[PDB]
Symmetry: C3
Subunit: 196 residues, 3 copies
């Protein structure tokens, strides 16, 4: 058990909900958070697991969202998050088993990335922009604009941290025509971490 890593395990089963209103997993979310000094080194990827997700790319303009809300101990609050199974430590290629006593040290810092406090506050320092890709059936690479939001809005009283990801597909013509497994290539990023 390596406690310097908070993740979904390598190659996880459907554990994430991307469809609006849905409650049951419709895709596989791979997320790796690693404590690296004052930073967290992150790794994230999405793999479709339903006709809905695997059809999304028959359109030329799509936006996928995965929202993550954590309590005061860095535990995922499922009813508020797209991810339906809590993260855990590294135990080889899987998620360690048992209760985690605080993963606070893995959360985005509230000093560096604050929560909105007043009506018109923009807080643009709470955003990370980047890019990853989708490889279509014929082999073409479609660029996906990625936006990461750290602690900008709280959604309920027991919520202490937030981490949102969104992938944006805005191309000339749809990538696919058939139902093809939705795969976002590895997105890398880092952020100032909260103290333990």
């Amino acid at each position: 058990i390596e406690n310097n890593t908070l993740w979904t395990g390598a190659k996880p089963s459907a554990n994430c909900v991307i469809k609006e209103g849905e409650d049951s997993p419709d895709c596989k979310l791979t997320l790796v958070l690693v404590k690296n000094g004052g930073l967290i080194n992150g790794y994230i990827t999405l793999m479709g697991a339903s006709e809905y997700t695997n059809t999304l790319f028959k359109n030329n303009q799509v936006t996928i969202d995965v929202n993550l809300a954590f309590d005061n101990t860095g535990q995922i609050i499922t009813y508020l998050s797209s991810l339906k199974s809590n993260l855990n430590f590294k135990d080889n290629q899987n998620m360690a088993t048992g209760t985690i006593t605080s993963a606070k040290g893995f959360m985005p810092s509230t000093t560096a990335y604050p929560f909105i406090t007043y009506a018109t506050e923009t807080l643009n320092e709470d955003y990370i922009y980047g890019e990853c890709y989708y490889k279509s059936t014929n082999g073409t690479l479609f660029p996906l604009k990625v936006t990461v939001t750290l602690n900008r809005r709280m959604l309920a009283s027991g919520m202490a941290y937030a981490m949102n990801f969104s992938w944006s597909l805005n191309a000339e013509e749809a990538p696919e025509t058939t139902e093809v497994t939705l795969i976002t290539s590895p997105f890398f990023f880092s952020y100032i971490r909260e103290d333990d």
Copy 2:
């Protein structure tokens, strides 16, 4: 305290100077350097804190430079740098208090990234090119080409290492029309580190 992290602290006060021939801080520079094996994982963000900086983006072609000069012990030499206060180790969300006995290990390898020795010498292995973004008032994302110069040019007799950053804006038209806090989205990078 965590000595594998050399940083400006999370959310620092104005501490950097971007305007020509100035002495007083006109912007907030966040720089995190973490020791990770033979590498340094870096994070850097800029937040303007003056009328001159928060107005730079009323133009479409802007280049911002933040130059860092260090002594033989990896300490900042303020009169040679844009950053006007030495970096220090991590102590929760702050810069540690106390004297630093060498931070040489956080510096750019001179073996990998050499200093210029002759006149027409280019040493292109000293550059790291990447990209980050500025989000305007109306929500549009402007790309900023980031250049990182490792060592290469030496300025004074006491200077042992250098690290220069430059954000380059080259848009169709001016992102802004008003004075808006300049904000560069997190840029990530890595480099071969100097031995301890």
Copy 3:
């Protein structure tokens, strides 16, 4: 000596072959792999060391390939790879001396990035896409599309892992006219790692 880092050493001597069917190192390959929790933080750069490699960019369309095959203990399989000299632990700015008794812990996870089990199998999760740059003589920058293939294709019985890199240039017109040193700017990446 630091065994949490596996590399070619900083600024190494010609150690890589980019030419078809060749066996004599015609370029310098800088590759650093650091164990960072469940991930491996990577850094990679190339430098021409022959007329062949330093002439390539006299064309507008070029693709450089660096293939890496490893055995069940993370050791390079030279007859199968482009890197003709094994990697080793960190010893200051050099490769440690001696025999690495297993570098499996630095290998691409077979669970996260599986090998093909049949004919028409795609395994698109085995790719990482990104970008680095080339600074020409006139100072202009040319974007190079980078593609990393993790495992996926097995080539011989003694193979257990793969890590191929490919730089792709596709610009209006050739970056050069003269034989100039080939230098790709640092490409950063992470991947889920194989258990020790």
